[PDB]
């Protein structure tokens, strides 16, 4: 199917670009805002996006006989002004990933392609998982004004159905 | 120093783009040429370029007070026709990395910046290491015509006191 | 070489005097500002400066046939007024050590003395390491106003592949 | 008490300066007289004087509310001519430390200050201990003329219920 | 680079010839001067020179694409008359190796060849290490007149963080 | 005995020069012919010739009161053109070592010197041992045309553990 191939190539492109942006944001949070553990958190997000999230797509293309495309273009030239606004923009990016995955699932069920549906269930689940763990950190910036307290909470964060 | 900052930002950009290109080449070698172990080899190269080779630069920028820039642009739209030509183009890329690193070292010694010299010794050594391990695979395609023999040799490859 | 001998004797003198000053500052931070863990931190700095940082110089003088000189003179007559200003003056001292070491390295490379260059690489690296770990503590006094929170952070501080 | 504070500050100054002088003497004995184990012995003496012998004084000042002073001034510009004369001057320094400690103890008992008496018992005992272990080495230079024999005896030295 | 190739071939030749000469000297010291442990020491030196000190050069030539040459010519026709004069001539040979290595390092830094500089740091360090351990034995022949005492000292010799 | 001393000094000289030549050949086989395991094999040969094969002679001279001489002169200026011709020239060198050792044994038995006979039995045995293990590799270049197959065979020859024969060990 050509439209499933197109949709999965777009998701590949998206994952690569998000990973690079998160690497830059991790550097900015640790270096400029004096929060090294928030930086570790965003860096783990980046490595997640740059690893399995595209390994699985290229493995699937190897298995079923589809074609892979590589066309990357990113440029970070504007940065939020807090750690609050930083983690809020991270939240928005994850929320967009959810809706893109939903569109893919609908498409695959409209084509009678049940292997692609089985394949995309993984991403369906992982989207809500990642959004939940990002919102856990987003909500700490409302519960406290002291940066070292938030820091130790984040540190101890980083150290059945949605598994 | 501004010129050292420029040179290190360029090396960051280069490492990112090489890693992405090697990911595509690994997929092509496994899927199109029927050589899964050559693909594993090139994929390990890709992960190497996308991991520590840029972690170290961003860590150094955190330590000494320099500024990081992100501007990536890659597009793979032409592919070699063999596994031989594929690994030969990989060899050429590594050989270019060597010369870029040499230019950086010369620059850093011209500025009386000895922490940058100490820092770039790592890349100086790793360049020759990676070129050596890529040439080991390049030379197998001259020693045999049977693809399964080359395959098992590469497999048992993937499975020093100065250049360690 | 006589100028390398002079430079290394000056670095010996400097290390001794810095160690003594840091011992006094550790006592002042624990006793007068009610921060015992900041005192432990500065005391570890002092022992570092009074141990290996001069053992290595005297060992090198034994190995290559140079002469050692001892002329110490310190007097603490003024103290900062916070723990913030205290750790800030500590930061300035480390930043001066960096520049002295850089001058030594330049000198040694100008004399074709490659054993002294090899020797001073250690200090080149350790300078940035110590500056980094001191700045880690300097930046905590901007992130909080409660002394007990900063205290437990410093406590859990006190309890790399290139910069190791 | 002000006179006990003065006496303990003087003992602090004395310990620092003795430690530095012993570091220089250790270097001289190993490098110039060709006796590396005598150098190890004097170096252990130096580290002893620069460690606990002043840590205890500054800890006591923290506990009872006294004030610490730092005023160091040393200059080594004359050296004995043997290893015999070297260890003999070391013996004289230890013998002076004994008498200074005795004066402190008398003073503290004259002021009805029993915590300072309890504190100085440690130094009273350690003085005779250190003098005994230095005289053990001083007497070897009378029992033999061969330097390698004395050397191996000192080496196996470096490798009580009341005076423990 | 051709001049670096020439210099490294000369160092190869030198190492081979020194190893052979030290083998003969070890035999002479054990057989003719009745000092078997001095012979064991010089034989360890010989095996060191004939092993890694040329294995590394040939490995480097394999890695970077240089050419190896073999042209050996030694002839022992005169021998010192003591064990003292023997170990003194050994000291002189090591001191010449140091200066040859220094010339190589200068040359390699003049050509903008940073892999050769990185490579020769090993020899720069090992030169001073070997000179130090030879001088340790040279100085024993001044500290004693009894051959059996020197023998047991050398035996227990044969049985660092910067110079390691 | 002076003639036994002469013969053993010549064998010392020969062993040193063979070791150096084998070091150069190992470098050439690994670097120029793209056969790293053949290079490892020839390098083990070189270390063998430069170690015990002259340690034993100098030890014997220490024990019985003979004199040692050192006069070395080698120059490699011509190289074979294959790995086949390389291992064939190695075979010829070992075959010459055998005949030199045989001459020594005859000489020592002609002088009523039975300690030298007892001493040279070791070299008598080791000559045939080394010739056998070199011929094992020489014959692989007739059994195959693929360089990677020969390489794998040589690898399992060199890496697997050493088993001693009950007569020739
Ligand atoms: Fe995920
Ligand atoms: Fe690498
Ligand atoms: Fe340090
Ligand atoms: Fe004591
Ligand atoms: Fe060595
Ligand atoms: Fe053999």
Q: Closest Cα partner for A1 from A101, A99, A110? A: A110
CA end-to-end span of chain F? 30
Q: Closest Cα partner for B74 from B44, B46, B33? A: B46
Would the CB atoms of C124 and B112 count as touching at under 8 Å? Answer: no
F73 strand-pairing partners? E73
Separation CA E100–CA E6 (nearest Å): 13
Distances (CA, A) of A26 to A23, A32, B10, D97, E111: 5, 10, 20, 59, 40
- How far E103 CA lies from chain C's nearest CA (Å)? 9
E118: chain B residues, CB-CB within 8 Å? 121, 124-125
- Give the residue carrying structure tokens 């190993």: D30
Separation CA A56–CA A8 (nearest Å): 11
Q: Closest Cα partner for B53 from B29, B85, B19? A: B19
Would the CB atoms of B125 and E114 count as touching at under 8 Å? Answer: no
**Neighbouring C-alpha atoms within 13 Å toward the C-beta of F76:** 18
Separation CA E162–CA A137 (nearest Å): 45
Would the CB atoms of D68 and C20 count as touching at under 8 Å? Answer: no
SS3 at position F73: strand
How was this one solved?
cryo-EM
SS3 at position D74: strand
Of A20, A50, A54, the CB nearest to B72: A20
Task: Give the CA diameter of chain E.
Answer: 54
**Residues near A153 by Cβ (< 8 Å), separated by ≥ 6?**
A140, A144
The answer for B 76-95 residues in CB contact with C (under 8 A) is none
Handedness of CA D99, D105, D107, D109 (dihedral sign): negative
**Residues near D104 by Cβ (< 8 Å), separated by ≥ 6?**
D4, D7, D8, D11, D120, D123
**Residue A34: left if φ>0, alpha if ψ -120 to 50, beta else—which one?**
left
C65 → chain E, closest CA residue: E132
The answer for A 38-77 residues in CB contact with B (under 8 A) is 50, 54, 58, 61-62, 68, 70-76
Separation CA F13–CA F15 (nearest Å): 6
**A76 Cα: distance to centroid of ligand 2 (angstroms):** 26
Separation CA C44–CA C90 (nearest Å): 13
Contact F24, F136 (CB under 8 A): no
Q: What is the resolution of this structure in A?
A: 2.7
Of B62, B73, B76, the CB nearest to A73: B73
- Give the residue carrying structure tokens 């360090």: E125
- How far D47 CA lies from chain C's nearest CA (Å)? 9
Q: State the virtual CA torsion across E76, E78, E83, E87 in degrees, nearest 10.
A: -60
**Residues near D113 by Cβ (< 8 Å), separated by ≥ 6?**
D1, D4
**A118 Cα: distance to centroid of ligand 1 (angstroms):** 17
Of E64, E114, E122, the CB nearest to B162: E122
Contact F38, F154 (CB under 8 A): yes
F58 → chain E, closest CA residue: E27
- DSSP E strand boundaries for chain A: 71-75
Q: Closest Cα partner for F143 from F130, F156, F154? A: F154
Residue F116's CB is within 10 A of a number of other CB atoms, namely 22
Q: State the virtual CA torsion across C59, D33, E97, E40 in degrees, nearest 10.
A: -100
On whether any CB of chain D is under 8 Å from the CB of E140, the answer is: yes
Closest ligand to C46 CA? 3
On whether any CB of chain E is under 8 Å from the CB of B110, the answer is: no
Separation CA A134–CA A22 (nearest Å): 13
**Neighbouring C-alpha atoms within 13 Å toward the C-beta of A37:** 14
CA end-to-end span of chain B? 30
Alpha helices (H) along chain F: 2-32, 36-50, 52-64, 83-110, 114-138, 140-143, 147-159
Of A21, A68, A71, the CB nearest to B75: A71
Residue A72, phi then psi, degrees to nearest 5: -110, 140
SS3 at position A50: helix
Separation CA C164–CA A24 (nearest Å): 25
| Radius of gyration from C-alpha coordinates of chain F | 17
DSSP code, position D163: T
Separation CA F52–CA F122 (nearest Å): 11
On whether any CB of chain F is under 8 Å from the CB of B147, the answer is: no
Closest ligand to B123 CA? 2
Q: DSSP letters of B57-112?
A: HHHHHHHHT-----EEEEE-----SSSHHHHHHHHHHHHHHHHHHHHHHHHHHHTT
- How far C162 CA lies from chain D's nearest CA (Å)? 31
On whether any CB of chain A is under 8 Å from the CB of C105, the answer is: no
Contact C147, C35 (CB under 8 A): yes
Task: Give the CA diameter of chain B.
Answer: 54
Angle between helices E52-64 and E2-32 (to 10 degrees): 160
Residues with CB under 5 A from ligand 2 (ion): B 48, 126, 130
Separation CA B120–CA B102 (nearest Å): 9
**B22 Cα: distance to centroid of ligand 2 (angstroms):** 13
Residue A68's CB is within 10 A of a number of other CB atoms, namely 19
On whether any CB of chain E is under 8 Å from the CB of D149, the answer is: yes
Q: Closest Cα partner for D38 from D49, D52, D22? A: D22
D149: chain E residues, CB-CB within 8 Å? 149
Distances (CA, A) of F139 to F88, F126, F143, F150: 10, 20, 7, 10
Separation CA E34–CA E27 (nearest Å): 10
- How far F76 CA lies from chain B's nearest CA (Å)? 27
- How far E143 CA lies from chain D's nearest CA (Å)? 6
Q: Which residues of E92-111 are buried (b: 16+ CB within 10 A; e: fewer)?
A: ebbeebbeebbebbebbbee
- Give the residue carrying structure tokens 């594929």: B86
Alpha helices (H) along D51-146: 52-64, 83-110, 114-138, 140-143
SS3 at position A93: helix
CB neighbour class for F58 (10 Å; exposed up to 12, middle 13-18, buried from 19): buried
Distances (CA, A) of C123 to B50, B110, C116, C127: 31, 20, 11, 6
Distances (CA, A) of E8 to E4, E61, E113: 6, 9, 14
Residues with CB under 5 A from ligand 6 (ion): F 48, 126, 130
On whether any CB of chain F is under 8 Å from the CB of B140, the answer is: yes
- Give the residue carrying structure tokens 């620092």: D16
**D124 Cα: distance to centroid of ligand 4 (angstroms):** 10
């Amino acid at each position: 199917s050509n439209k499933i191939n197109d949709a999965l190539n777009q998701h590949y492109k998206l994952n690569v670009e998000l990973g690079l942006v998160y690497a830059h944001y991790a550097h900015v949070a640790d270096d400029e805002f004096d929060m090294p553990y928030l930086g570790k958190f965003i860096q783990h997000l980046s490595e997640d996006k740059l690893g399995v999230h595209k390994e699985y797509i290229s493995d699937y293309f190897k298995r079923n006989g589809m074609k892979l495309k590589t066309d990357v273009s990113v440029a970070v030239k504007s940065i939020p002004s807090d750690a609050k606004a930083l983690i809020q923009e991270v939240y928005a990016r994850e929320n967009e990933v959810r809706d893109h995955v939903k569109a893919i699932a609908k498409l695959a069920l409209a084509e009678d392609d049940y292997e692609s549906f089985y394949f995309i269930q993984w991403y369906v689940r992982d989207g809500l998982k990642d959004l939940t763990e990002v919102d856990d950190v987003v909500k700490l910036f409302n519960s406290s004004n002291d940066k070292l307290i938030i820091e130790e909470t984040i540190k101890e964060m980083v150290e059945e159905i949605w598994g």
